[PDB]
Amino acid sequence: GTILLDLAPEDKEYQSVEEEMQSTIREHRDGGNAGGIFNRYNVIRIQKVVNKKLRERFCHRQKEVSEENHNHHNERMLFHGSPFINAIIHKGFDERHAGGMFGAGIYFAENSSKSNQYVYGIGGGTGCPTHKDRSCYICHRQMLFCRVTLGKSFLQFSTMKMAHAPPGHHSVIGRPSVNGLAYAEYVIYRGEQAYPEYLITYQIMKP
Ligand SMILES: Cn1ncnc1[C@H]1c2n[nH]c(=O)c3cc(F)cc(c23)N[C@@H]1c1ccc(F)cc1
Ligand SMILES: [Zn+2]
């Protein structure tokens, strides 16, 4: 099954992942309601996720997408927050579990703070299980930093609800715009198009 390999804080790989997590924090339109109020995280640990079966499905799909995109799979490393991270690291992403702006897909953010708004559910739900606080500064949260095969992407500023990527395409990118999205989002419609590469355990920090 799945093996988690702990990254040391002195490793350049650990440092690269933390830097991407910290530097992509942005100012949210809800004032912190969903994800909590913070300017930085406290990273507890970063683990590499190893799953032979998930890797095989991912690599198989990556080759199909590369062939349909002029031999370029076009991967991006993107964040994913979910109260179901334990199932994802064992079973992978599953599009069958997909109100989304781009329809029935699997969603990722390039801004870690956007994925953080989803760690405890839509709008943060009732927050951490122990204290029922969306802004809990004690409980450890988890998010994934994933390899996402975008292939030939379809870029949009406004909502476009679909069941699958458009013909010939492999993903949908929602870009920010005035009167549109605040931050980008990336959507795939096949679970095998993402690999949950890193598992980050963290706390948000009180300003
Ligand atoms: C609530 N939910 N369930 C599965 N995926 C999600 C959300 C989501 N989860 N996780 C992320 O990191 C994320 C990063 C984004 F840029 C954008 C996202 C998400 N939108 C998703 C969304 C929001 C409302 C909705 F009705 C359906 C889907
Ligand atoms: Zn708590």
Numbering used by the authors: 1105 to 1202, 1205 to 1313
Quoted passage from the original study:
Poly(ADP-ribosyl) polymerases (PARPs) are a subgroup of four enzymes (PARP1, PARP2, PARP5a, and PARP5b; PARP5a and PARP5b are also known as tankyrase1 [TNKS1] and tankyrase2 [TNKS2], respectively) that continue the reaction (PARylation) to generate long chains of linear and branched poly-ADP-ribose (PAR) on target proteins. PARP1 is involved in repairing single-stranded DNA breaks making its inhibition an attractive strategy in oncology especially in those cancers that have defects in additional repair pathways. Thus, TNKS activity promotes Wnt/β-catenin pathway, and TNKSs are potential drug targets for the treatment of cancers driven by Wnt/β-catenin pathway, most notably colorectal cancers. We determined crystal structures of the catalytic domain of PARP1 and the ART domain of TNKS1 in the absence and the presence of the ligands.
The TNKS1–talazoparib complex structure clearly reveals conformational change in the protein D-loop upon ligand recognition. Likewise, in TNKS1, ligands stack on Tyr1224 and make hydrogen bonding interactions with the corresponding backbone atoms of Gly1185 and the sidechain hydroxyl of Ser1221. There is a single substitution of Tyr889 in PARP1 with Gly1206 in TNKS1 in the D-loop. Tyr889 of PARP1 is seen offering van der Waals interaction to the bound talazoparib. In addition, Tyr889 is also poised to make edge-to-face (pi) interaction to the fluorophenyl group of talazoparib. These additional stabilizing interactions are absent in the TNKS1 complex. In addition, talazoparib makes a specific interaction with a conserved water molecule. In all structures reported here, a structural water molecule is observed (except for the olaparib-bound structures, where it is displaced by the carbonyl oxygen of the ligand; see later). This water molecule makes hydrogen bonding interactions with the imidazole sidechain of the catalytic His862 and the backbone amide nitrogen of Tyr896 in PARP1 and analogously with His1184 and Tyr1213 of TNKS1. Talazoparib uniquely makes a specific interaction with this water molecule through its triazole nitrogen atom, which serves as a hydrogen bond acceptor. Thus, strong binding affinity of talazoparib for both PARP1 and TNKS1 relative to the other inhibitors studied here could be attributed to its rigid structure that is unencumbered by conformational energy penalty in either of the complexes, its ability to make stabilizing interaction with structural water in both enzymes and the lack of overtly electropositive nature.
